[PDB]
Design a protein around this nucleic acid. Structure first.
Lengths: 45, 380, 610, 171, 330
DNA sequence: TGGAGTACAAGTGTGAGGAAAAGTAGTTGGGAGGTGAAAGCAGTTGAA
């Protein structure tokens, strides 16, 4: 499960090899990386 | 090219088993036919073989598994199923291989797609190379079921079935060795013989001389003049069958002959089904957000009150129903201006006979004179 | 006046929603576009008839072969009587034969008398000019063009006691300059190929070209269409080709190339409307209504509409309509390839104000296609129009009043041969079927009286046994002939192969004959799932195949009954290919020929992949 | 497809928020007998935010939020290669008003230059400046100072007084 | 019959244009060396000419310095006989490389004889063949005032690959004349002037096939026919909702600094404001000196319409319209 | 009567005309780049 997000339409997005860095719904070049369920720990202080 | 031609061969054979119900042994009949043309490839050395294949090669080696099984399918049905896009013939290079396309050169993709349609009897002439590169004589049997042929041709024109045997006595009288309307073979060169040596086309010229001889030579005065006007305009009546609208597509593709621009006199409802057929051409056939914004503003389905769910009981009559309008129209059953008014039906049976069999005019006209001065020839 | 101009060009294509707003705050139509609005205009024919009589190209030096318009002769230049409509047309063998009244439609006269002057050259153009409303009359003369000459005729003082139309003449002025001339107009003003001249017409038929002329000769134009018209009466001619329009004043010394149409169009036709100012121009891709100018009558190019049909042989006819507040201008383009028409309805208002409505089309007669369409002046929103056509491969002149309110010769001249010994011997087969149809109706009627009998049941008992011996012989005829690696008859019997008459009862035999076999080498193809290419639909049973075929020939035959039985039975004698061997037969040869090619041919012989 | 760039895009992309500069020429030959007019592209000139030429010009604080800006987006600056820069304001002399100034750096210029001199900073209607200085020399001579192309030109006054209009010696 | 939006290319129609435009050049270069004493072969021929690019035809108006004297030097047979022989004798070597009908086509078009077989006929492609079927019924049902059926033809026609700008925007009355479940027709013209609008220079040296300037492209010095269509139809619609500020801002953003027709409609936006606002419904501080802009914007934007090239306006009638606006201003 | 030319037909021989997805061709039209002072104060030379 590959996930980015476009900064314009907020449509979640995967990006394979030999692709343009563009969104597929809109034609937007800036495209930001989402976060997944991954463990980070914090001392509640 | 031999690799991708077999996959398209596999996919055309798959649909005939899947919907139209040609048997699960019929795949195996054409398979050895595909295997013995590979032995003709084995007959040539691989260095400069220059194999002779075309898009007619996939209609041909399907045709020689068909009448070997003595099926009622012919080239009249191989010219409808490719034009109405029922089996993947045209644009078969587009969607079929899906991996072998990226490695396939610019003329092995254009030969392999449906670029041109078979014209002026091109379809029979690949069967001549199919009966020469492997001999279809002395291996298989070139006999045709010609009664499955003439059964279809009666209800197309809706004459009384008296002409079935009247055509049949014509064929028995002319053919040496009465039976065995066999398919010809040609192994020699590119010289297609100007004789109309093919079995199914001979039946069509035998049928042209029946409708003249059984009406012009009738002293019995059984056939009235009101019936001639009632069989012409019973055959000159356009309706909404899946045959006549499948006939409309074949009338499109051929540019040279008349009744090619037949769409100027289409009715209202007949035009819609030509567009309802257009939902069977697009399923075969970065700068995508542009067209998506135009496909949004032109939705291909109707914007409101469509025709899929809550439409009707029926709109489309079946192929058995127009004959109850074709045979019930002709109530009359019990002259130098009549022998020209035999031609109003002689040319109107002709137009449906040229374009539904993919030959020109002179391919039937010279086919007459190789039969007309050959049936009268036997007496004197 | 509106807002849309450019000073050289002025456009209004189809449903552009044109550029002529003004925002009039009068609370009734607050916009004055170049478009009208009304209801529809469907056109119905009123058909009548007037008179009658290399291969991949067409020679553009022909213009017309017929003309017909109201005339006013010398006796009508004297008396109260004004207006008789005539026709000037060609007929005969090569069109070199040169030769009326309105009851309710246009018709040829009662006295059936044409004026046959003999001409020794093929006719390329026939026209009468028509006069202007500043000279008050309708012109009595007529100018035509032959292939070998240039002859000018004149109608003079026709009769009413016999409707006699007689001609005076000018002489045939042959090509003293030896070049073919193309299009004439009077309104002896001539246009030769590339060059032109202004002529003088004589009143003296009892026994010419001035010293003012010119040329438009384009070295980079390879066709020979040329065209001249008087424009706005001030001695200004408009000389055309398929490339450009030149405006030439032949009274002063002042020439102008006005239109230049070499880039993406040409010039197809230029009909001079009988109006003095408003005149249409037909190009390809656009229909132009370029009129003359108000201050100085030189040229003022007015509102035009684009024309989608493209062809090389397009012409136009154009007929006015006089109404109180406006004037319509219908625009019928036509071609030499098809039978269709294309029309448009412009409108002329008082301040040289132009508008548009839309477009429509009609259908015609299937013998050939039109080559020339001519309208009727008719001597003077429920629109009416009238015209008359002339089709190619024909010579008839129909009549039409459109208003708001296929036998090929080769399929006919190929049969019916005229010999004496061969006059009835073709009908020997006609006598042969009458010897067999009378026979083969009595042979079947043996079996028709047999209905659920034992006398017909014992045939099928012998039939299930006469096929059963030679078929197990045939099954073992394929094991002895199995060592081959190198076929179906159902005519093994010789009794009659016709002697049983039932659709359901033979299916009891053959399905029991199908339950006969269970071993290998014997395989039967389907019939209830394989017959269905004829009805093009479901055939759940072979019995109910016949059911709707019984509902098919009820009215069209005597007794309609036994023939439909026996053809369905003949399909069982024709479709039943039932001698396929079993699975040892394909499998022994799907690997043997796979061995005749090497390992390169193995993987390139591959199925079962998708 | 032609789209519309907002300055939130120029901060993620780390690029300049530029508007296109067009500049139509008058190529006249033989002093106006044949003119050749061509608008030309002169590159992007960066654009101050919430000005006439920004897309945030007359735009609600609701719509500044829907276009990724602060609700009270301030404007008044340029975005140049991601860095968000502005132009300092300068204190300069008042326009179009002569200033009687003594300056010790007037006798720097050489012989007989006194410490006195009028100075006016005259601006054109296109807000372009041109400073004239009117010196006083100790010999009674009064001069006129100006600049042109980084160079400094000393001239007498009564050559500039007498070239402006038709002057007598009482005028 | 109708024009079909196909980039159909055959070598037979491409050699016979490579054959004819060769023959035009030798016989025009022959006419050069007679009138004085008295490599592609198509890219060379069009360098003589100037393509119109605002119009199908370069209309040269008459009342100017384009007057000309008549050459009374007519063409006789003896001038026409040897000016055509030696270019025909110099054409003789490629006339065997061509087909047997091209040489027959050539000697046909050596003597006039305009052809009769059009390129839309003998293509036999099955993909262009359904194009030519669908284009004619498209133009027929719009002509036959049938709109639900033409909307179904046109939705099918644009989805076939190979089609052009030709069918797209011209007969988009099918949304404008539907108005029942419509997309209003003006969203499609917005689709046109957002993706096809380019400000490239018309390069004029390349030989244009299947894209033609005057009715489908939008270069510099030629505003597109669909761009100015989206101007007028969105101002007539802008009246008929009684948003004028939405387009008066929108027209302000392009500096179409060549053409004069966009300056009239940019005056006509404020002329609709000064007609609508000048009502006031009283039987008074800011509404009087806001219209005094809108009168002044119509007056200055009409002058720059006169400052640009040829587009005449009834500026005598507009000042009769504008003074009648002033009668309620006072 | 015994012997020659009309033309029904028929197979022999030779290239030519057609198709298309690919490529290279010919122009443009953008883009970021890359190829000294403010003041001393001294020593030294300055000059007719």
């Amino acid at each position: 499960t590959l996930k980015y997000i476009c900064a314009e339409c907020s449509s979640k997005l995967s990006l394979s090899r030999t692709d343009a860095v563009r969104c597929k719904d809109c034609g937007h070049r800036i495209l930001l990386k989402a976060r997944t369920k991954r463990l980070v720990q914090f001392e509640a202080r | 090219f031999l690799k991708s031609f077999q996959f398209i061969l596999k996919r055309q054979i798959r649909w005939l088993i899947t919907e139209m119900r040609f048997p699960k042994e019929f795949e195996h009949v054409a398979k050895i036919i595909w295997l013995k043309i590979l032995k003709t490839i084995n007959d040539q050395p691989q260095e400069e073989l220059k194999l002779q294949l075309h898009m007619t090669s996939t209609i041909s080696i399907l045709y020689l598994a068909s009448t070997h099984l003595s099926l009622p399918v012919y080239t009249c049905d191989y010219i409808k199923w490719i034009c109405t896009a029922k089996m993947p013939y045209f644009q078969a290079s587009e969607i079929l291989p899906k991996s072998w396309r990226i490695q396939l050169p610019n003329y092995y993709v254009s030969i392999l797609e449906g670029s041109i349609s078979p014209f002026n009897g091109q379809l029979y002439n690949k069967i001549a190379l199919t009966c020469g590169m492997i001999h279809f004589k002395e291996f298989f049997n070139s006999e045709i079921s010609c009664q499955g042929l003439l059964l279809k041709l009666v209800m197309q024109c809706a004459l009384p079935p008296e002409f079935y045997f009247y055509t049949k006595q014509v064929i028995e009288f002319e053919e040496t060795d009465i039976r065995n309307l066999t398919l010809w073979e040609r192994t020699d060169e590119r010289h297609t013989g100007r004789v109309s040596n093919h079995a199914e086309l001979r039946v069509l010229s035998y049928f042209m001389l029946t409708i003249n001889w059984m009406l012009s030579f009738d002293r019995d005065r059984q056939y009235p003049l009101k019936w001639i006007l009632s069989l012409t305009e019973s055959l000159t009546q356009r309706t909404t069958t899946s045959e006549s609208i499948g006939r409309n597509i074949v009338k499109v593709v051929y540019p040279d002959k008349p009744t090619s621009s037949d769409y100027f006199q289409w009715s209202e409802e007949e035009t819609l089904e030509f567009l309802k057929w257009m939902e069977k051409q697009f399923l075969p056939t970065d700068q995508k957000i542009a067209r998506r914004k135009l496909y949004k503003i032109f939705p291909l389905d109707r914007e409101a009150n469509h025709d899929g769910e809550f439409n009707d009981s029926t709109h489309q009559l079946t192929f058995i129903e127009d004959l109850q309008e074709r045979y019930a129209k002709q109530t009359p059953f019990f002259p130098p201006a009549r022998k020209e008014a035999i031609g109003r039906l002689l040319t109107h049976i002709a137009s449906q006979l040229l374009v539904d069999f993919a030959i020109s005019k002179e391919q039937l006209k010279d086919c007459i004179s190789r039969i007309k001065n050959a049936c009268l020839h036997r007496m004197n | 006046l509106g807002v849309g101009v450019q000073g050289a060009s002025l456009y209004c294509p189809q449903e552009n929603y044109t550029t002529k707003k003004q925002e009039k705050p009068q609370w009734l139509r607050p916009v004055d576009d170049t478009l009208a609005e009304d209801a529809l205009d469907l056109h119905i024919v009123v058909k009548s008839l007037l008179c009658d009589t290399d291969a991949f190209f067409w020679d553009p030096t022909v213009a017309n072969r017929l003309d017909s318009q109201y005339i006013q002769t010398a006796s009508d230049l004297r008396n109260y009587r004004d207006g008789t409509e005539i026709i000037a047309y060609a007929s005969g063998k090569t069109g070199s034969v040169l030769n009326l009244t309105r009851q309710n439609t246009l018709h040829l006269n009662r006295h059936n008398n044409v004026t046959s002057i003999e001409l020794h050259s093929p006719i390329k153009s026939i026209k009468i000019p028509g006069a202007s409303e500043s000279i008050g009359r309708r012109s009595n003369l007529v100018g035509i063009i032959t292939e070998n000459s240039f002859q000018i005729f004149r109608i003079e003082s026709v009769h009413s006691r016999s409707c006699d139309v007689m001609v005076s003449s000018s002489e045939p002025l042959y090509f003293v300059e030896i070049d073919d001339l193309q299009v004439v107009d009077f309104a002896a003003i001539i246009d030769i190929k590339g060059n032109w001249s202004i002529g003088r017409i004589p009143k003296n038929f009892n026994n010419l070209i001035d010293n003012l002329h010119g040329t438009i000769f384009d070295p980079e134009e390879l066709s020979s269409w040329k065209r001249i018209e008087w424009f706005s009466h001030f001695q200004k001619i408009l000389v055309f080709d398929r490339s450009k329009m030149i405006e030439i004043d032949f009274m002063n010394n002042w020439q102008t190339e006005v239109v230049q149409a070499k880039a993406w169009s040409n010039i197809r036709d230029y009909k001079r409307i009988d109006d003095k100012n408003g005149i249409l121009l037909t190009s390809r891709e656009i229909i132009i209504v370029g009129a003359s100018e108000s201050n100085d009558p030189v040229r003022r190019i007015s509102w035009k509409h684009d024309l989608d049909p493209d062809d090389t042989t397009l012409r136009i006819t154009v007929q006015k309509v006089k109404k109180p507040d406006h004037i319509l201008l219908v625009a019928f383009v036509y071609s030499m390839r098809h039978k269709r028409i294309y029309m448009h309805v412009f409108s002329h208002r008082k301040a040289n104000l132009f508008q548009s409505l839309g477009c429509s089309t009609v259908l015609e007669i299937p013998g050939g296609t039109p080559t020339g369409i001519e309208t009727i002046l008719t001597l003077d929103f429920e629109l009416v129009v009238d015209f008359l056509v002339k089709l190619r491969n024909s010579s008839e002149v129909y009549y039409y009043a459109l208003s708001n309110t296929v036998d090929h010769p080769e399929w006919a001249s190929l049969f019916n041969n005229a010999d004496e010994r061969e006059k009835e011997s073709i009908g020997a087969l006609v006598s042969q079927i009458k010897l067999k149809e009378r026979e083969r109706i009595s042979r079947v009627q043996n079996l028709i009286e047999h209905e659920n009998s034992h006398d017909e049941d014992k045939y099928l008992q012998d039939l299930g046994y006469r096929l059963s011996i030679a078929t197990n012989e045939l099954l073992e005829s394929w094991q002895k002939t199995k060592d081959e690696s190198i076929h179906s008859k159902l005519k093994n019997l010789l009794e009659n192969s016709d002697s049983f008459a039932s659709i359901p009862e033979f299916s009891s035999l053959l399905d029991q004959f199908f339950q006969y076999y269970q071993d290998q080498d014997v395989t039967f193809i389907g019939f209830e799932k394989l017959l269905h290419l004829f009805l093009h639909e479901d055939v759940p049973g072979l019995d109910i195949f016949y059911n709707k075929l019984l509902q098919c020939w009820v009215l069209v035959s005597p007794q309609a009954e036994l023939l439909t039985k026996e053809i369905v039975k003949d399909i069982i004698w024709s479709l039943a290919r039932l001698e396929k061997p079993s699975l040892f037969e394909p499998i022994q040869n799907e690997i043997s020929r796979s061995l005749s090619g090497p390992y390169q041919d193995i993987i390139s012989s591959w199925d079962m992949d998708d | 497809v032609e789209r519309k760039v907002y300055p939130s895009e120029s901060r993620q992309r780390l690029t300049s928020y530029r508007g296109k500069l067009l500049l139509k020429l008058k190529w006249s030959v033989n002093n106006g007998e044949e003119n050749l007019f061509e608008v030309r592209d002169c590159g992007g000139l960066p654009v101050m935010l919430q000005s006439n030429r920004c897309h945030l010009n007359k735009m609600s604080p609701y719509e500044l939020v829907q276009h990724k800006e602060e609700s009270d987006e301030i404007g008044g600056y340029f975005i140049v290669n991601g860095i968000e820069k502005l132009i300092r304001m300068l204190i300069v002399q008042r326009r179009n008003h002569p200033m009687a100034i003594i300056r010790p750096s007037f006798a720097n210029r050489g012989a007989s230059y006194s410490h006195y001199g009028i100075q006016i900073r005259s601006v054109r209607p296109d807000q372009t400046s041109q400073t004239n200085v009117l010196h006083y020399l100790n010999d009674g001579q009064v001069t006129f100072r100006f600049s042109w192309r980084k160079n400094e030109y000393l001239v007498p006054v009564v050559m500039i007084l007498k070239a402006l209009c038709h002057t007598s010696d009482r005028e | 019959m109708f024009e079909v939006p196909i980039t159909l290319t055959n070598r037979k129609f491409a050699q016979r244009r490579k054959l004819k435009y060769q023959y035009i050049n030798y016989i025009s270069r022959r006419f050069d060396r007679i009138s004085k004493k008295s490599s592609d072969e198509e890219r060379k021929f069009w360098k003589k000419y100037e393509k119109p690019e605002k119009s199908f035809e370069i209309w040269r108006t008459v009342s100017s310095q384009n007057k000309q004297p008549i050459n009374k030097q007519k063409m006789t047979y003896h001038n026409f006989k040897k000016i055509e022989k030696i270019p025909l004798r110099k054409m003789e070597i490629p006339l065997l490389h061509c087909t047997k009908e091209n040489k027959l086509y050539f000697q046909s078009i050596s003597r006039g004889l305009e052809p009769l077989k059009t390129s839309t006929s003998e293509v036999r492609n099955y993909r262009t063949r359904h194009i030519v079927t669908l284009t004619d019924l498209l133009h027929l049902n719009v002509s036959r005032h049938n709109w639900s059926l033409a909307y179904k033809i046109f939705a099918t026609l644009i989805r076939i690959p190979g089609v052009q700008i030709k069918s797209l925007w011209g007969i988009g009355v099918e949304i404008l004349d539907n108005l029942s479940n419509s997309s209003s027709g003006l969203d499609f013209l917005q689709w046109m002037c957002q993706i096809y609008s380019s400000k490239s220079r018309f390069v004029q040296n390349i030989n244009y096939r299947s894209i033609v300037p005057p009715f489908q492209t939008g270069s510099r010095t030629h505003t597109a026919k669909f761009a100015i269509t989206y101007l007028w139809s969105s101002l007539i619609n802008c009246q008929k909702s009684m948003l004028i500020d939405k387009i008066s801002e929108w027209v302000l953003t392009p500096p179409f600094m060549e053409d004069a027709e966009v300056w009239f409609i940019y005056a006509s936006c404020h002329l609709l404001k000064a007609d609508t606002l000048s009502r006031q419904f009283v039987n008074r501080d800011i509404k009087i000196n806001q219209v005094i802009k809108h009168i002044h914007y119509v007056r200055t934007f009409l002058k720059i319409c006169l400052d640009k090239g040829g587009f005449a306006v009834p500026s005598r009638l507009i000042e009769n319209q504008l003074k009648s606006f002033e009668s309620r201003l006072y």
